[PDB]
């Protein structure tokens, strides 16, 4: 159960966290969905 709790902590633990044209082209889909 401790190991499973460690995995459950890791999940959101990882969930919580070039050229500028590429920098914004990589996040365009995220911006569109979030703005919807």
């Amino acid at each position: 159960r401790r190991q499973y709790g460690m995995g459950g902590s890791m999940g959101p633990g990882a969930g919580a966290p070039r050229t500028i044209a590429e920098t914004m082209r990589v996040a365009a889909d995220t911006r569109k969905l979030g703005k919807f």
Partner: peptide, 24 residues
């Protein structure tokens, strides 16, 4: 007609929460 996603993180929460005690 919706298609929806079920987050598996809920299942991880269920796994992390266990009664154990004398039962287990």
């Amino acid at each position: 007609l919706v298609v929806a996603g079920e987050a598996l993180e809920s299942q991880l929460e269920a796994l992390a929460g266990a009664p154990i005690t004398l039962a287990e």
